[PDB]
């Protein structure tokens, strides 16, 4: 039944990228308060399956399209409250809301999209939000301000476990080719142009940006797990404009720029798009595949792109002025021709420590995989798919095998001391002693295992305090070390919960 | 498959009786040039069955109706290039193209509508044209100039005889 | 009536580096098996059937297991630094970090694997630019090294495409 | 069907080791242009099986023997344009063309002899050439200069993979 509700206020002039508001899911249920809210208090923990309904007057004369973004871990909020760039709003699970279709509805299986169960009394990690933003604006302002109603329906029952089932299990050798929530930012066509081209890059491993801000997301991360791909792009096109705007598109793939000869254009294998619908276009390349990422000085247009040619239109009555927006969603690479995996089932760099200024250096790891900082030495963090997967989920858990390697700054014959691995259960002050290990510095290498997790069963991608095993690296002669490299290799079953994004 | 193509330019104010343009059928195929054009060279003579497709954004808010006139013998061309009276454009085989219906398509059995086979190297009698004219105009001008694409689809094969079967 | 094979399923020499003039020496391998050059040290390339097979095909692809061995020029007790293997995906500037490895110079030997290939699936026997894994050997105390020997042993299935020749 | 063609010029005095010319395979198809060339543009990538035909008046009174060398990776071109030593011309896949046998024909499975599929718009690695050279000369010069015609027959269809099957 109805479990919670809220209201989104729409300005009469709703322009592309306007932030409309954020609803806090738990507040919607507690402010309502609520047959379901009361069942929740008794249950303590709930892992709901929500039906979200946005009540919304259907209208075909505006061209408005909104995006509802499920931000369970509060990753994009801070960056969209002034203006909402689609790169952010589309970087977490999301749904397109088209004005012509009116009242909207979808299911959010909180077990999958979120991963952790909700506690009646307070937020556990971060507070789960629904963001509402405008993806494509109204052709002209409406008559007056208005509002839409957001409603949560659920039959809350007691959750048996804290943790959901993992959205993703780490495996280098596995990138299927099926995507979810891969939506390209809107492409725009001017009506003051008799024909036109809009290119969409297919270098899908490239990390999207908003100004100088990188927005790590799961889809680009997944693609980066592969060297490149060919095959057929299956997607959907949405024409986001009033019934009185219309267009005809020739959609085709081209390599390294575009032909200037209209006749050559139509000898390629494209498809015509007149209206909302699906499409399949073969990825076109001299190598039959396009690379997953760019090298220095390369551009996405240098490789394989999905090209949208306006061959008739767009047209509209006078005196319309708005552009005609096209929203493209990519669902899968069918009949895929994949490159090798970019990584093997092997170690990869976690961190290098170097330029030590003190002989005594102690690096606390605890139970986390994360980015180190130090005032006393230089930290160089590794960048790779695993690290991005950590960053693109709410929770994760598993075991890392560690390899440590080091080289000397001083003469070998003069060397002394150790790289010591402290392993406790608890913390430094009151912890129990586990398989701590003293590696005499002359060994020049060592191994150990790290539990990434805790008694609750998973770590957020933030600092937190939950009883667990605890690790530290202690150096007593650090100035003798030129570099200390730590590599890790996840044991099978390393688990991620709740796909999301990570702006930096 | 696609055998030839061309473009018709529509003014923002498309009034009843505006001449929009003429496409020359053989030129569409030879400018394209063309898997079919190349099959034609080898065949010498072709008696095509063309599928004509006019790609055109569907719109219910204009009232625009166009006429495509198939003028295989170049009988009305000279008289419609300034202004196209419907008496001329409707006096040869023709098709109505309604804007509300969007993308348009029809079959032209060249054997029937034309009668003589086409010679790869040059026109025989006269050069077969498609004329595009506006039959009923837009209620008010549109936002801007635009264009429509005309396409010819055919699987050209060698013609066995010069002459078709008699229409009459 | 054949003799024994001239080579067994074993390693063979790819390259010896020696006579280092600078302590900092960085040898870029990328994703290729090829002939090195250096202005700062002496390169001695190995000659064997595998290298000729690479030279006598248009394209090749596979994986090489590498063994590195070295000896000291300076006194063991005074030694420091490392033979470092950098393994990225992409390139030096924007690449992702793989199984890089720091071999303290006192180890006097190390191993690693090299992908000879790229996203397209094969390498020409020339310079080329195609996204792939990327390897380099970094020396920080090269003048302490008398010789650095790199041996390779192709994993089963190392493939060649397009028999041809190679004049030098 | 015929997909491309070219011409080789034979001097009246065709001596051992005369370089006669080089045909560029992709140019033969694109200059022809071509039912097959046009199918290629649509396919993007082709892995043809070519039938090569050299049209050539049979003659038992000359002693002339030529070599056609398939140089898919442009490895011998630079070294044979002044004079073609048989060590070069016989070092890549090649066919002997005996004057007494007249018109010559062979199959080139581009999948095997080359390894990588051809891209309609530009050369990928290097541009595949056919070289024509004289292996054994005429006993005495002929009456006058002449020519031979080289023809490529293929039914080009879309290639499913970039890479062939490995020769080795």
Residue numbers in the entry:
A (entry chain A): 1 to 504
B (entry chain T), D (entry chain E): 1 to 168
C (entry chain E): 337 to 504
Sentences from the paper on this structure:
The B and C domains clustered at the 3-fold axis. The structural variability of CP subunits within a capsid was very low.
differs from its parent strain (GFLV-F13) by a single Gly297Asp mutation. position 297 is replaced by Asp. deficiency of GFLV-TD by X. index. transmission was correlated with a lack of virus retention by X. index, although virus acquisition by nematodes was not affected. solvation shell via the addition of 60 negative charges in GFLV-TD. with respect to that of wild-type GFLV-F13. feeding apparatus, thereby reducing its transmissibility. ligand-binding pocket was correlated to a defect in virus transmission.
